[PDB]
Design a protein around this ligand. Structure first.
Ligand SMILES: NC(=O)c1ccc[n+]([C@@H]2O[C@H](COP(=O)([O-])OP(=O)(O)OC[C@H]3O[C@@H](n4cnc5c(N)ncnc54)[C@H](O)[C@@H]3O)[C@@H](O)[C@H]2O)c1
Ligand SMILES: NC(=O)c1ccc[n+]([C@@H]2O[C@H](COP(=O)([O-])OP(=O)(O)OC[C@H]3O[C@@H](n4cnc5c(N)ncnc54)[C@H](O)[C@@H]3O)[C@@H](O)[C@H]2O)c1
Lengths: 345, 345
């Protein structure tokens, strides 16, 4: 277990140290081979090295088995050249590692339904993982352009692009409830027909996992009326972009959300939230997204699924025993991390 | 007021007769010049005329100032040739009239929050109108295609396409709360930049209406966390397709939803619901979507806004006094239409 730890700016060090305290305690009781190195990343590195993804950091990422990122960005570096912003160094980290699948889970922990915008009955039991394709589709498609009379952009997918993001979904689903919904617009678009066609064939090598297909406009409706029926949801880039934000409002707090980017290189695990300058240094930032990102690392980077689930239960009990300020409690980052560790022991 | 009335199949005649009873009563108290003709449309016309949009119907639509459609479709005509289905004659009706804007409102009437999938506090006061562009974008864009190794489809918009759907949104907003949100993906797509650019300029001729711009992935989140802040929302075809279905789950009943398609020809007004064969003839179908479609006709086809709003209030009181079976009450189509008329008098 060689992890590069890039804490970044704002509350990024704060919540990353909390994730590190959980990983270290877990390494004692279980004897992992946790070996980690902390690096300068974005903003903290613009200050030391004059540039957001400095050469030591790049080597460290390249040499580690997984990255545990915190948060980048901040006022201090906002009006800069777009080349050197903390924020573009984040794109450079994913791009350098050829990360093509973004995994973003939305879970309503037991007893936390009151926070969901949805009624308790509908919010109960939601635990959905949206797998979004990151490297293709309309955001990168050519031809694209704009004249004075019109504009065009191309939604394009090749067969290996679809096959590889669908393999991450089938493999993810195996560790979970073995059900994959693939989302497309196949009744109107040939890219949809193609997508459905390819995932269906990928599904044949995973006979233990059920695959269902749904249209995106109908998935937007199911994610609000009955989100608790889904497990893994895999889709294209623009559709994954809309749907993982829609599912992300269902828990009711930005500090509860972990993410992962898997690909050819070193996988990055990170909180959906940013650097939150307004609450930085106040010792109150909710470390749950970071601790659950570290759990996602145990599961997706090191295949340690029962340990990943042990960390999720400990976090689920902690959120009910001493909730952070953003879920209406009073527990600061330290008091809350300690409740988590109490439930690991 | 010359209306062509195409009741169609299933519960279509049932809920259309209810809309007609409201229009007739209203024509007495106010003295409209309501003159309407009932025509054979889809399914009922495949039986009489062997084809879903027969020549008498086509002439009647063409001669009327507005169309009040009911519902088409049904088992009786399901396995047919795709050329002659009831359902394709519906596409032919919109296409023959050059209808390019689809208007679909989602309203949580007072006291009906309990039906919304969202918590009472969030569901309270939702009254949003999604204006969807119907004729362009990726669903019709060229080039499109599919090889064995890949597929492509083109999201393309011309300047008059955007300008004209945005004009319908600005005009609609004037009769409502004067606020338009335009939805795009302008931080990544040139079609988005173009869309935003053109609506902004259209907005200059409507200085009394506020215009705000939002990204689609962020609109999907706002429509669940705080839908009550919006009034009119105008967007492209694929985005309008996803967002008007997302907003349509917020009331909690398919029988509450009216729609309108405005364009160059004769505007069609219709319930979002279909022909519902399972409850047809049982005298229990909820006529609210049809009565509110007739109200939408008063407002958008004949500019009669205070009369359109009078019908909406009467329907709002009726839903609280004698709710249909689908909102948990016991009132059949007739008993419910009578409560509405009691509140018009
Ligand atoms: N370059 C880009 O494209 C880009 C894009 C987005 C953000 N950024 C940068 O990153 C920073 C992001 O800050 P922001 O305010 O936009 O978003 P944010 O997600 O950091 O914060 C939003 C809100 O949620 C709260 N929050 C976030 N995490 C929390 C946690 N763990 N516990 C409790 N509360 C939490 C914050 O306090 C704040 O009230 C900015 O300063 C910006 O410079 C850059
Ligand atoms: N050709 C096409 O592309 C196409 C597409 C969709 C539907 N159709 C046709 O139209 C018909 C649609 O039927 P469906 O079941 O799919 O959808 P539907 O919307 O008619 O019915 C769905 C459910 O909602 C209920 N419902 C609908 N309106 C109601 C109302 N006013 N009051 C109370 N309950 C109501 C129904 O009873 C049913 O339980 C089908 O028979 C089909 O042939 C064709």
């Amino acid at each position: 277990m060689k992890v590069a730890v890039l804490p970044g700016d704002g509350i990024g060090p704060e919540v990353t140290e909390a994730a590190l305290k959980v990983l270290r305690a877990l390494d004692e009781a279980e004897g992992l081979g946790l070996a980690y190195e902390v690096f300068p990343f974005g903003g903290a590195a613009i200050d030391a090295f004059g540039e957001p993804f400095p050469e030591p950091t790049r080597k460290g990422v390249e040499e580690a088995e997984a990255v545990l990122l915190g948060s980048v960005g901040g006022p201090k570096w906002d009006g800069l050249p777009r080349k050197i912003r903390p924020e573009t160094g984040l794109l450079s980290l994913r791009k350098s590692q050829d990360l093509f699948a973004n995994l973003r889970p939305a879970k309503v922990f037991p007893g936390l339904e009151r926070l969901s915008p949805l009624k308790e009955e509908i919010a109960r039991g939601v635990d959905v993982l949206i797998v979004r394709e990151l490297t293709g589709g309309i955001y990168f498609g050519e031809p694209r352009g704009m004249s004075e009379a019109e504009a065009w952009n191309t939604e394009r997918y090749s067969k290996p692009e679809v096959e590889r993001v669908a393999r991450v979904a089938f493999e993810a689903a195996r560790k979970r409830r073995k059900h994959v919904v693939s989302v497309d617009k196949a009744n109107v678009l040939e890219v949809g027909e193609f997508w459905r066609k390819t995932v269906e064939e990928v599904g044949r090598g995973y006979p233990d996992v059920a695959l269902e297909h749904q249209y995106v406009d109908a998935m937007a409706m199911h994610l609000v009326r009955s989100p608790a029926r889904f497990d893994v949801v895999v889709t294209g880039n623009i559709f994954g972009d809309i749907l993982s934000d829609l599912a992300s409002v269902l828990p009711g707090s930005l500090g509860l959300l972990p993410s992962a980017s898997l690909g050819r290189g070193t996988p990055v695990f990170e909180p959906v939230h940013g650097s939150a300058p307004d609450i930085a240094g106040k010792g109150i930032a909710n470390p749950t997204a970071a601790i659950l990102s570290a759990a996602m690392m145990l599961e997706h980077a090191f295949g340690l699924v029962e340990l990943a689930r042990k960390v999720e239960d400990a976090v689920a009990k902690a959120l009910l025993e001493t909730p952070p300020p953003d879920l209406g409690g009073s527990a600061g980052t330290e008091a809350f991390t300690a409740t988590v560790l109490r439930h690991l022991a």
